[PDB]
Amino acid sequence: TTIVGVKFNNGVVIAADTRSTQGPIVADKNCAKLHRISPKIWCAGAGTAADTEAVTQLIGSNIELHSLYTSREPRVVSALQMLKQHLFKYQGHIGAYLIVAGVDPTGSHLFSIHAHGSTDVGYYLSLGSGSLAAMAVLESHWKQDLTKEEAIKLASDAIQAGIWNDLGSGSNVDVCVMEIGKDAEYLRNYLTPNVREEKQKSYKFPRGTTAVLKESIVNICD
Amino acid sequence: TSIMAVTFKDGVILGADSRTTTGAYIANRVTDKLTRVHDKIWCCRSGSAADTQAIADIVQYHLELYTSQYGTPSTETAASVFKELCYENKDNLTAGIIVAGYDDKNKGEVYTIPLGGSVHKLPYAIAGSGSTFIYGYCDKNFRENMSKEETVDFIKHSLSQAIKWDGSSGGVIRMVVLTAAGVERLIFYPDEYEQL
Amino acid sequence: SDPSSINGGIVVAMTGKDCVAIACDLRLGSQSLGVSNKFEKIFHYGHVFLGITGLATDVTTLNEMFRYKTNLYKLKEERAIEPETFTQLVSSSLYERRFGPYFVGPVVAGINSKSGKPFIAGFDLIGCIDEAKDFIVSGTASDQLFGMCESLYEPNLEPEDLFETISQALLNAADRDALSGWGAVVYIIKKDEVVKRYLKMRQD
Amino acid sequence: AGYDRHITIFSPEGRLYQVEYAFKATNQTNINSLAVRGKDCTVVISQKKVPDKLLDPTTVSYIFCISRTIGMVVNGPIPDARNAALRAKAEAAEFRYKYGYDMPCDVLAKRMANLSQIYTQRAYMRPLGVILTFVSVDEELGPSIYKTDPAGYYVGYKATATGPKQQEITTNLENHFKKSKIDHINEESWEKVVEFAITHMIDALGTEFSKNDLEVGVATKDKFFTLSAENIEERLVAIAEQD
Amino acid sequence: NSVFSPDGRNFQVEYAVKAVENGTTSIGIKCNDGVVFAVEKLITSKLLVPQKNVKIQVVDRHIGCVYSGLIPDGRHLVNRGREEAASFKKLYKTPIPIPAFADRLGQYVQAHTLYNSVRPFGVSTIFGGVDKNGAHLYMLEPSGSYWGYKGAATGKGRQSAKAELEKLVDHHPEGLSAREAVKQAAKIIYLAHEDNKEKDFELEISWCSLSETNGLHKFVKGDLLQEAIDFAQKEIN
Amino acid sequence: TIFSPEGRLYQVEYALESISHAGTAIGIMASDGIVLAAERKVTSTLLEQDTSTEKLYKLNDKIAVAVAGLTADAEILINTARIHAQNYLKTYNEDIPVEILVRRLSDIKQGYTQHGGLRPFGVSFIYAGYDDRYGYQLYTSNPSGNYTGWKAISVGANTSAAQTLLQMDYKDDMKVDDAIELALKTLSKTTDSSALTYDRLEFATIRKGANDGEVYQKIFKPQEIKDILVKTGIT
Amino acid sequence: MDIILGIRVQDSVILASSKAVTRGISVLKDSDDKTRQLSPHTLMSFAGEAGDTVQFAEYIQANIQLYSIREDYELSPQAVSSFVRQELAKSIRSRRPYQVNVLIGGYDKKKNKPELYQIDYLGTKVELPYGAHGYSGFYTFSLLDHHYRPDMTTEEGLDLLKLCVQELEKRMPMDFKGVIVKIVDKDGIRQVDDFQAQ
Amino acid sequence: MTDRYSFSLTTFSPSGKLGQIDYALTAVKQGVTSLGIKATNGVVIATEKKSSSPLAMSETLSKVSLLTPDIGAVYSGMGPDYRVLVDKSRKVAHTSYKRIYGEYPPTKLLVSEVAKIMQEATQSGGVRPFGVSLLIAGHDEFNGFSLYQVDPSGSYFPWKATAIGKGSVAAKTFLEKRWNDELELEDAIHIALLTLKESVEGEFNGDTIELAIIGDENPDLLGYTGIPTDKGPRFRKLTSQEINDRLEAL
Amino acid sequence: FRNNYDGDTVTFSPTGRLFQVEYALEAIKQGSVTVGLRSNTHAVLVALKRNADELSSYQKKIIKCDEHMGLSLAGLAPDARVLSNYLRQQCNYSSLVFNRKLAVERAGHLLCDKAQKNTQSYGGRPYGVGLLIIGYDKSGAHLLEFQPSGNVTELYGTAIGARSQGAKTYLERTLDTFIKIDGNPDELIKAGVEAISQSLRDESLTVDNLSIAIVGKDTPFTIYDGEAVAKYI
Ligand SMILES: [Mg+2]
Ligand SMILES: [Mg+2]
Ligand SMILES: [Mg+2]
Ligand SMILES: [Mg+2]
Ligand SMILES: [Mg+2]
Ligand SMILES: [Mg+2]
Ligand SMILES: [Mg+2]
């Protein structure tokens, strides 16, 4: 997995590759690692895939309830405090590593959370097996006060580093842009540089090829 | 990690490097290790980041509740809350905390709570992996009742040595000055402190 | 030894033009000893199909748990659970057992009765959804299945062709796995009708 | 003695007598209070009555600092008031710990009202005989007044008054906002907003106050604080030159 | 208890107050650096062992309590106060501030007026000591109500005691030394015994003074007691 | 919970008293099916008929209940009965025998009668079911937790009046279609309204599944009730 | 290690269970009956860990007997086996699991068919023409795959079983002291007390 | 500390009445009128903002509440009981449904849960029933638009249109006259405004009336784009200004 | 006034009285008389035991709590058993944990606090027994009187139970003599046996009527009954 977060002058962008693996094997060639906690607070995870999704949804559900109750737009510091306190309680057994990013009435925010429940803040971050490839790009090109365009380019490039050099990452680049003024934009398969080439031959079989022992219709209704 | 707190004439100063590692990888080169638990009570954290953040958060909660009910807590009260948490949970915590604060009556104070959960009141304290390299130096150069600028220098020199030898320490040197004045954040960059 | 290797078993699901298919082997073994030649691993709640591979006791238990849960669903809601929702229900049911998981690899196939769109999904033992639109594979010959599917598959196959593809993928993967095989059953699922075929295969 | 008068079950008319009785308890101290919004502050004024001369005047107060940013004034007997203050403090500290931001004035009010509702519904708890007025300069909503009663009701106010002579003050302020046509006082200094509040308390109640007859709490951006006798004396002098 | 009267009162608490008025008289006096506590002990019979049914109680090391009404209810209140002061010291290290301690007792007494299954306490308690920032004296009623006092009395002699207390506040606005307050306490207890004269009484005094006891709570005994008894004997005649 | 000097249970008695004011429900068992018919309590033109079910509830695929009493109490019970049926299915891989489900439900009611100082549930049930031990079955249960089996029965208002009428026309050899008629006639005779129109009825059958070898529950849409009110000649 | 075999013929289910109880270096007993009747048309045989074995069987026996009296009815073999499976499935994740494997042979009156279920300690259930637990299946499954027919009579089944017992006596390292054989059909459960030299 | 009333406070009377439930229904009667009207393509729920002081700010107190993106509620009766019921209803939508099926409950099932919460206040020891009747309006894919009433006993009924509180009987009459099954949402908002004018004492404008609709998806109100199968909430509170616009044409 | 106010211990009368507690105090007045008194070196309990019949045993009034402590009872006997058991436990605890003999005074405080909780908890009655506690500790001989209201007082001598007012008046009179009865166990007992006499409308107190207990300086707490008391009649 390669996930990055990058702050720009008026917002925050996150991005991720689209490959899930069971050890050496590629399960999903185009899964979605970008998760919504609330409309303008988004999330990318690495580690135990079930864990990052569950902890995101639990906290997403409680953040919705908090917002309704308080009549206020959810804050990124709340997602953080709830995630970190939850993860801490489970003493790393919930293997969630997350980059959490958003805009709220207080401004724009970029945070990291580790499975034991420690958090950090910064202007640029990476996580995942591709984390070193992506950080090397970030450390090479990140400047203070980037425009929106530059930030998308830099994040996109960081994910590419992970896609090309980390065997744990591959396929596509997903992006989400959270600007202070606006609605969050989720950009699914913003880059697709790993198209499978056309096969050399068609493997469709002549009908009758398979030997059938017996047969019957299956009843669905009642 | 290299962290220290030093008492001086007008108060207390906390300082730290800014590097967090997982193995030999620098996870964060610009960490802020100086943590406020009240207006004029801060700490430096060492050991497990998860553990010390969770503790610092609980302490901050306790000191806010304390302030609502009884008024400004002393630095001793702060230290005692940390100790209670550390001692009582010694079997699932790896936490070493240095607590530093200023008030009007008691002036600048420093307490260190190392791994056991013991508490020690001290004129100055050092801790973190990098601290072992500066025991000799700090003991030779510390004096009571130093001025602000002398104290800033002592920490600056001390931590630059700690950073020089410890691979776990490094980045920028952050400091917080705590006096009647006031709360002041200082930062110092490699290009400066490496030439010391 | 490893709970997911004791009993043997494979399930695979594919999408085609206005249909889905789901297939499984019939083996139930106890390590090296083959015990049953008739252990089916695909089930259905109304028009929603679920294959489960893994420890057989958990295969049976989860079938009973999902019959139970879908029956109550239909009673309160006055309609049959759709593929997407059932997928969610499997995922949350599995995650609920996060630190004492069922040792299974479930697979869901079906056609949404409102949109008519074919749907398949897979899960790991703790409920992580593999959302994939072509094929899903599970079991002690999953490497063999991924291999077979990635070569054999092409999109929008007619039901009679998709039948050949899924069968060929299953048979040949099963024959490279000591713990799979011993009979195979294939379901072709068309909105309107569902045909079930037992395949002839090597009995070793 | 019917049971519908002893615990919070419905009367045949659909009323809750113990709740209504609890409102009556709120006046038993014969103190009036009022609250106004400035341009970037919020002020609360309450009467201070120290009848017994064996009392230490500094410990006689019905204004509480709930948090760094929220003040609360109570109309009602002190034991129930302190019970409510303690709880509000605990709820405020807890909110900050759990959600990482300071508890908003209105949200604390909604929460304290919810606790009140419960006493309205469960038999074994008596309602508290107090009305709670919460003030702050909210970071999202600006200067705020939210008031909660033994019924579990709460709402936001442009200004408000509470106590036996609540009505006098209310209609006075109502008259004021009719003229100004805006929903706050135009003034930048919280000192002037305090003076306005004291001034209109004086008219409405037709009484003069020394520095020991008043008690003042002021909320600004990020503090809430109470004035000392001397700060108040300085306010009284200021108003006596022109009115 | 949980029951409001149609006009917002609580009759059970009002009745609890009657138990207090019925009680022996007790007082406290705040001085320039401390606090003095005194109480009337009715000698029912000559068989009561003198000096040996101590009514004044210490909490932690720096706080005295005296009460009038049902004695068992006071002891209950002090047990709870001791637990509450221990818990404070355990967590914050410092001995509990008097205002902090007041509220702890306050919240506990108030709690016993919320629930139909509990009765209010049948005491008023006068208490205080020295903390980080001076001397404090408090009085706590069966309702949970409490305020800070310059001087306080409760029990049967309450009215005359308050009258005497009020005089002292007027003659000595520049603060009363701790040694003076002791004498005056002995006097005041004598001048509220008038009422309950039928049976004999014995005097108990305790004090907490920054300069006289180092801010620790102590019992007045020996020569200091005898001298305060003499002052009161000579000033009643 | 307490006994009266007569050895009766006040709260139970008063709960039955409450049920006698509720809309009448009728159950008739024939040899090839069962009928459940119920009258909705004084309605209004604006009430949604198309998405309403207050008196007839499905317990599983082979069992249904007609309710007389507080709906909200009935939903509590219905829900536990549904769970109970599924536990049984899961434990034995067989659909629950009707009696067993009725007995469990009755036992929960009996419980409220004997301990805990909560009020009983103000509910009476007619159960319509099929199983392979007893075929078609009809049972009744009331707030006491007592239950009994029947060929035809009513609950709620006018049971005494409705019971006499059923006694009169009921014959063992009946088809379900004859039972349909009997139930509608009996409600028609016993309403406290002008006529028994479709909009005031809930109706359901448990038949031998058109042509199969299987059991089918038909919960009548309003349209079907209007049409079946045509045949039996009550327009 | 305990031999537990089952074969389902046309009109009955036959169970055979070894008679030995061995602890350490000693055979303590040579007439052990590894069987409990659950209901007049359902029999269960069991093998596994020392104490768990009887405790489980008797607990199941108590439960089915309770049902019978409550309902004045006999649960079908399919129902009893589902019930048994669930008890084992719960047990496998409890503090101390029951280590018991069972065969359930029953005659179903509603269908008029014999039925044989094999369930191991994990709650793995399967319905089989013939089955075994432990090592004995390593010999008997292949023998029966060869010699078994679906339409065998009871006597044919007993011959087929004699063949299995012969094979086990020849090849199995342990002395299991013969079996006790029980037949379950429409007229209930009966023991063939002549097998040791039949 | 610890409860003394572990017995039902709602018991049956000799006549079969459940007194406390009746008395709560009397509280609903005293409450300000609210109503719901269902159209072909929407539901409207409306009520009056009976303010307690001219010094209060009536926008800070909403009587119409979002429960899910597709479900809203209004009430008549005791406001504080409503407020806590709304809290619990939002929560139970998550705990009993969304955390299980990954989607929001259909209208009838959420109503069903609210109904249960109310039923329990009718049976449990030491409590009084809620003093409210709710109208709940919603949409869901498989049932379309719906409107439900829920009463202090826990009973619910589906309505084409209804009214609760003070002038309910007159308003129910005015609605039976005016409702048909070809009504468009705009027409139903109109009828709701007319019906409400009879009930309203003082000023009748976008500041004194509170009105919300269950209509089509507001893809703007979502807060994000890029997921095409997410089109936004169907619940929408009309603004002050939006209301006055329909009052001119009234 | 006494009307709706004596239902439970959880209700004040409009005079500020607790009737359940005052009623409990009335069971003491029913109980058979007992006397306690002490000097500087010993403390003595004397009790008149009461039979239920001429065919019965006179029921015991004296209970040993520790080697240095015991008590006599007047009122509900099973209530005395609850409290003496608790006191035995408190004595024991103090020995085991601190190797300390429990102060008679602390025993007072403990019993008092225990009685107190029962004067304030819904659904429980107050204790209906009065107790006289004697012991020898590190500050000498002690006598205590315990009332179920929770009031405990230290006295040189006292009596509780029916007609006890006589004995009390006698002890009030004798005071200055028995207080000095030191190092003479038998004279102090004689003074207690005589004090109890002033409380007889009964009979001439017999070898069964009489229960005597003693504790002091070099004497563990010990109970005399039957033959061993004859030398005092
Ligand atoms: Mg790669
Ligand atoms: Mg370094
Ligand atoms: Mg695999
Ligand atoms: Mg194979
Ligand atoms: Mg209440
Ligand atoms: Mg109560
Ligand atoms: Mg007084």
Residue I186 phi/psi, 5-degree rounding, is -70, -35
Of B61, B65, B68, which has the smallest distance from its Cβ to D65's Cβ? B68
State the residue for tokens 């087929």. Answer: G160
Angle between helical axes of I165-178 and I185-197 (0-180°, round to 10) = 150
List the one residue out of B96, B147, B150, B100 whose CA is nearest residue B123: B100
Distance CA C190, CA C78 (A): 23
Distance CA A104, CA A81 (A): 15
E155 Cα to the center of ligand 7, angstroms: 6
Tell me: domain H1-250, CATH 3.30.70.1450, correct? no
CATH number at residue D29: 3.60.20.10
Give me the residues near ligand 5 (ion), CB cutoff below 5 Å: D 8, 119, 125
Q: By three-state DSSP, how is residue A84 classified?
A: helix
What single string gives the DSSP state of each residue in chain I?
--STT-S-TT---TTS--HHHHHHHHHHHHSPPEEEEE-SSEEEEEE--B-SSTTSPPBP-EEEEETTEEEEEEE-HHHHHHHHHHHHHHHHHHHHHH--PPPHHHHHHHHHHHHHHTTTBTT-PPP-EEEEEEEEETTEEEEEEE-TTS-EEEBSEEEESTTTHHHHHHHHHHHHHHTT----HHHHHHHHHHHHHTT-S-----S---EEEEEETTEEEEEE-GGGGGGG-
Cα-based angle G174, G176, G181 (whole degrees, multiple of 5): 150
Residues belonging to chain C: 204
B42 Cα to the center of ligand 2, angstroms: 24
Distance CA D141, CA C94 (A): 44
Distance CA A20, CA B143 (A): 59
- Asked about A1 being catalytic, the answer comes back as yes
- Chain F positions touching G73 (Cβ under 8 A) are 133
Distance CA C174, CA C183 (A): 10
CB atoms within 10 A of CB I97: 8
Q: Which neighbouring-strand residues pair with A109?
A: A102
Q: Chain H closest CA to E59's CA: distance in Å?
A: 25
Tell the burial category of A146 from Cβ atoms under 10 Å away from its Cβ (0-12, 13-18, 19+). buried
Domains and CATH numbers, chain E: 1-237 (3.60.20.10)
Distance CA E93, CA E90 (A): 6
Task: Return the sign of the alpha-carbon dihedral for residues H202, H204, H206, H208.
Answer: positive
Q: Which neighbouring-strand residues pair with E211?
A: none
Resolution (A): 2.6
Distance CA I42, CA I188 (A): 8
Q: Which domain holds residue B2?
A: 1-196
Pair of tokens at residue I26 = 């009335």
Query: F71, F109, F115, F144: best mutation site toward chain H, by most H Cβ within 10 Å?
Result: F71
Is H47 within 8 Å of H37 (Cβ atoms)? no
Angle between helical axes of D78-99 and E98-111 (0-180°, round to 10) = 110
Pair of tokens at residue F213 = 């070898």
Is G161 within 8 Å of G3 (Cβ atoms)? no
Is D32 within 8 Å of D162 (Cβ atoms)? yes
Number of compact structural domains in chain C = 1
Q: Which residues contact I164 (CB under 8 A, 6 or more apart)?
A: I33, I34, I35, I74, I199
User: Is there a contact between G86 and F90 if contact means CB atoms under 8 Å apart?
Assistant: yes
Pair of tokens at residue A46 = 């690495």
Return the partners of chain G (3 or more C-beta pairs < 8 Å).
C, F
Query: E92, E103, E133: best mutation site toward chain B, by most B Cβ within 10 Å?
Result: E92
- Chain H positions touching D153 (Cβ under 8 A) are 52, 79-80
Query: F48, F67, F109: best mutation site toward chain H, by most H Cβ within 10 Å?
Result: F48
Number of compact structural domains in chain B = 1
User: Within 13 A of F8's CA, how many CA atoms are on the CB side?
Assistant: 8
- CA–CA distances in Å: residue C171 to residues B48, C65, I38: 52, 30, 104
CATH of I1-233, one of 1.20.1510.10, 2.40.30.330, 3.90.110.10, 3.60.20.10: 3.60.20.10
What single string gives the DSSP state of each residue in G106-149?
EEETTTTEEEEEEE-TT--EEE-SEEEEGGGHHHHHHHHHHH--
For A56: left if phi > 0, alpha if psi spans -120 to 50, otherwise beta; the answer is: alpha
The domains of chain G are located at 1-198
A20 Cα to the center of ligand 1, angstroms: 11
CATH number at residue B61: 3.60.20.10
List the one residue out of D2, D4, D23, D239 whose CA is nearest residue D130: D23
- CA–CA distances in Å: residue C109 to residues C19, C188, C190: 10, 10, 11
List the one residue out of I151, I147, I167, I169 whose CA is nearest residue I159: I167
List the one residue out of F43, F34, F82 whose CA is nearest residue F191: F43
Q: Which neighbouring-strand residues pair with E125?
A: E67, E140
* Residue G170 host element (H or E): helix G154-171
Q: Which residues contact D164 (CB under 8 A, 6 or more apart)?
A: D27, D30, D32
Distance CA D202, CA D197 (A): 9
Q: Which domain holds residue D81?
A: 1-243
State the residue for tokens 């056609």. Answer: C111
Is E107 within 8 Å of E144 (Cβ atoms)? yes
Q: Which residues contact H181 (CB under 8 A, 6 or more apart)?
A: H40, H160
Tell me whether C92 touches chain H (CB under 8 Å): yes
Residue D158 phi/psi, 5-degree rounding, is -70, -40
CB atoms within 10 A of CB F218: 14
List the one residue out of A122, A126, A109, A120 whose CA is nearest residue A44: A126
User: Is there a contact between C65 and F83 if contact means CB atoms under 8 Å apart?
Assistant: no
Solved with: X-ray
Pair of tokens at residue A208 = 């009758």
User: Is there a contact between B69 and D92 if contact means CB atoms under 8 Å apart?
Assistant: no
Q: Chain D closest CA to B89's CA: distance in Å?
A: 20
Distance CA I10, CA I5 (A): 9
Distance CA E39, CA F205 (A): 87
* Residue H164 host element (H or E): strand H161-164
Buried b (16+ CB within 10 A) or exposed e, B38-52: bebbbbbbbbbbbbb
G145 Cα to the center of ligand 4, angstroms: 19
* Residue C30 host element (H or E): strand C28-30
Q: In what order do the strands lie in the sheet with D131-138?
A: D63-65, D71-75, D131-138, D142-148, D154-156
User: Which residues have a C–N gap over 2.5 Å right after them in chain E?
Assistant: 175, 191
Q: Which domain holds residue C33?
A: 1-204
Alpha helix stretches (DSSP H) within chain C = 56-77, 83-95, 142-152, 159-174
Looking at the domain A1-222, which fold is it? Glutamine Phosphoribosylpyrophosphate, subunit 1, domain 1 (3.60.20)
Alpha helix stretches (DSSP H) within A25-165 = 49-70, 76-89, 131-141, 148-165
Tell me: domain G1-198, CATH 3.60.20.10, correct? yes
Distance CA A51, CA F225 (A): 53
Cα-based angle E100, E101, E104 (whole degrees, multiple of 5): 95
Tell me whether D124 touches chain B (CB under 8 Å): no
